[PDB]
Design an enzyme around this catalytic site. Structure first.
Site, PDB file in Angstrom:
ATOM      1  N   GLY A   1     -15.412   4.610   4.934  1.00  0.00           N
ATOM      2  CA  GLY A   1     -16.072   5.599   4.038  1.00  0.00           C
ATOM      3  C   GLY A   1     -15.746   7.024   4.481  1.00  0.00           C
ATOM      4  O   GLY A   1     -15.217   7.245   5.603  1.00  0.00           O
TER       5      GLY A   1
ATOM      6  N   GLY B   1     -16.085  10.455   6.058  1.00  0.00           N
ATOM      7  CA  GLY B   1     -16.796  10.802   7.307  1.00  0.00           C
ATOM      8  C   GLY B   1     -17.369   9.585   8.066  1.00  0.00           C
ATOM      9  O   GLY B   1     -16.759   8.513   8.101  1.00  0.00           O
TER      10      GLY B   1
ATOM     11  N   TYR C   1      -7.036   9.504  12.707  1.00  0.00           N
ATOM     12  CA  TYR C   1      -6.699  10.600  11.804  1.00  0.00           C
ATOM     13  C   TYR C   1      -7.005  11.991  12.409  1.00  0.00           C
ATOM     14  O   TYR C   1      -6.208  12.927  12.308  1.00  0.00           O
ATOM     15  CB  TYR C   1      -7.373  10.378  10.443  1.00  0.00           C
ATOM     16  CG  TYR C   1      -6.537   9.531   9.514  1.00  0.00           C
ATOM     17  CD1 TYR C   1      -5.807   8.417   9.982  1.00  0.00           C
ATOM     18  CD2 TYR C   1      -6.414   9.860   8.182  1.00  0.00           C
ATOM     19  CE1 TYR C   1      -4.998   7.638   9.099  1.00  0.00           C
ATOM     20  CE2 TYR C   1      -5.642   9.095   7.319  1.00  0.00           C
ATOM     21  CZ  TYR C   1      -4.938   7.980   7.769  1.00  0.00           C
ATOM     22  OH  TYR C   1      -4.190   7.241   6.868  1.00  0.00           O
TER      23      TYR C   1
ATOM     24  N   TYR D   1       4.591   7.284   4.079  1.00  0.00           N
ATOM     25  CA  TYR D   1       5.467   6.883   5.165  1.00  0.00           C
ATOM     26  C   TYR D   1       6.181   5.700   4.554  1.00  0.00           C
ATOM     27  O   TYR D   1       6.008   5.418   3.355  1.00  0.00           O
ATOM     28  CB  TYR D   1       4.659   6.532   6.428  1.00  0.00           C
ATOM     29  CG  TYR D   1       3.417   5.669   6.153  1.00  0.00           C
ATOM     30  CD1 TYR D   1       3.527   4.340   5.683  1.00  0.00           C
ATOM     31  CD2 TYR D   1       2.131   6.198   6.343  1.00  0.00           C
ATOM     32  CE1 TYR D   1       2.349   3.561   5.438  1.00  0.00           C
ATOM     33  CE2 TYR D   1       0.998   5.455   6.125  1.00  0.00           C
ATOM     34  CZ  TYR D   1       1.098   4.155   5.682  1.00  0.00           C
ATOM     35  OH  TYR D   1      -0.087   3.461   5.482  1.00  0.00           O
TER      36      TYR D   1
ATOM     37  N   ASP E   1      -2.895   3.377  10.223  1.00  0.00           N
ATOM     38  CA  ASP E   1      -3.204   2.500   9.105  1.00  0.00           C
ATOM     39  C   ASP E   1      -2.912   1.050   9.506  1.00  0.00           C
ATOM     40  O   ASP E   1      -3.725   0.143   9.279  1.00  0.00           O
ATOM     41  CB  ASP E   1      -2.432   2.900   7.819  1.00  0.00           C
ATOM     42  CG  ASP E   1      -2.890   4.235   7.236  1.00  0.00           C
ATOM     43  OD1 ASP E   1      -2.244   4.657   6.253  1.00  0.00           O
ATOM     44  OD2 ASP E   1      -3.868   4.854   7.748  1.00  0.00           O
TER      45      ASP E   1
HETATM   46  O1  LIG Z   1     -11.701   3.877   4.792  1.00  0.00           O
HETATM   47  C1  LIG Z   1     -11.600   5.150   4.329  1.00  0.00           C
HETATM   48  C2  LIG Z   1     -11.378   6.260   5.366  1.00  0.00           C
HETATM   49  C3  LIG Z   1     -11.707   7.468   4.781  1.00  0.00           C
HETATM   50  C4  LIG Z   1     -11.631   7.706   3.414  1.00  0.00           C
HETATM   51  C5  LIG Z   1     -11.632   6.674   2.468  1.00  0.00           C
HETATM   52  C6  LIG Z   1     -11.720   5.364   2.954  1.00  0.00           C
HETATM   53  O2  LIG Z   1     -11.940   4.297   2.131  1.00  0.00           O
HETATM   54  C7  LIG Z   1     -11.547   6.972   1.094  1.00  0.00           C
HETATM   55  N1  LIG Z   1     -11.459   8.315   0.675  1.00  0.00           N
HETATM   56  C8  LIG Z   1     -11.378   8.682  -0.676  1.00  0.00           C
HETATM   57  C9  LIG Z   1     -11.304  10.039  -1.007  1.00  0.00           C
HETATM   58  C10 LIG Z   1     -11.305  11.026  -0.007  1.00  0.00           C
HETATM   59  C11 LIG Z   1     -11.381  10.651   1.319  1.00  0.00           C
HETATM   60  C12 LIG Z   1     -11.375  11.605   2.338  1.00  0.00           C
HETATM   61  C13 LIG Z   1     -11.298  12.964   2.075  1.00  0.00           C
HETATM   62  C14 LIG Z   1     -11.221  13.359   0.750  1.00  0.00           C
HETATM   63  C15 LIG Z   1     -11.219  12.394  -0.274  1.00  0.00           C
HETATM   64  O3  LIG Z   1     -11.157  14.724   0.749  1.00  0.00           O
HETATM   65  C16 LIG Z   1     -11.672  15.138   2.031  1.00  0.00           C
HETATM   66  O4  LIG Z   1     -11.288  14.065   2.891  1.00  0.00           O
HETATM   67  C17 LIG Z   1     -11.461   9.316   1.652  1.00  0.00           C
HETATM   68  C18 LIG Z   1     -11.548   9.012   3.000  1.00  0.00           C
HETATM   69 CA   LIG Z   2     -14.693   7.178   7.845  1.00  0.00          CA
HETATM   70 CL   LIG Z   3       5.977  11.739   3.959  1.00  0.00          CL
END
Ligand SMILES: Oc1ccc2c(c1O)CN1C=CC3=C(CC4=C(C3)OCO4)C1=C2
Ligand SMILES: [Ca+2]
Ligand SMILES: [Cl-]
Ligand SMILES: [Cl-]
EC number: 3.1.1.4
Length: 124
Positions: free
Chosen positions: A30, A32, A52, A73, A99
């Site tokens: 999710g 954060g 990350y 990638y 990943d």
């Molecule tokens: O497992 C995941 C790990 C993290 C994330 C997701 C996952 O499903 C799914 N996910 C979908 C949309 C956005 C982010 C992160 C981010 C956005 C948008 O803008 C700011 O930073 C995001 C992070």
């Molecule tokens: Ca997370």
């Molecule tokens: Cl790239």
């Protein structure tokens, strides 16, 4: 890039809906995260988040909109096995490995359905 991560998960766990299964699981799967992960799966996600975080601190790598999810990638899937292409540049390879390690980790952790859509304001 994000789409390739989903597709890596689907390589490692052919029976899976990545967005249905792993988005909004536990405290870390999710956008954060907070507190301590609730099981090994959640901890796979916390490791991914920190992977990350590390990549963004590579002085050498400046991702689009500062999000390594934007960075594509090259990888392949064969019989459940993910291979990151060695021709990926150092920044791509780093993301690729975040990943892949997360997909491998997701595939080995137990899946506890109670932790899907966890009340994070309360448990995390
Ligand atoms: O497992 C995941 C790990 C993290 C994330 C997701 C996952 O499903 C799914 N996910 C979908 C949309 C956005 C982010 C992160 C981010 C956005 C948008 O803008 C700011 O930073 C995001 C992070
Ligand atoms: Ca997370
Ligand atoms: Cl790239
Ligand atoms: Cl918290």
């Amino acid at each position: 890039a994000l789409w390739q991560f989903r597709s890596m998960i689907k390589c490692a766990i052919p029976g899976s809906h990545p967005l249905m299964d792993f988005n909004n699981y536990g405290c870390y799967c999710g956008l954060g995260g907070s507190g301590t992960p609730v099981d090994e799966l959640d901890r796979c996600c916390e490791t991914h988040d920190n992977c990350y975080r590390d990549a963004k601190n590579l002085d050498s790598c400046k991702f689009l909109v500062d999000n390594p999810y934007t960075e594509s990638y090259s990888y392949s899937c064969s019989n459940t096995e993910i291979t990151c292409n060695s021709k990926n540049n150092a920044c791509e390879a780093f993301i690729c490995n975040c990943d892949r390690n997360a997909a491998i980790c997701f595939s080995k952790a137990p899946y506890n359905k109670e932790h899907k859509n966890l009340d994070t304001k309360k448990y995390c």
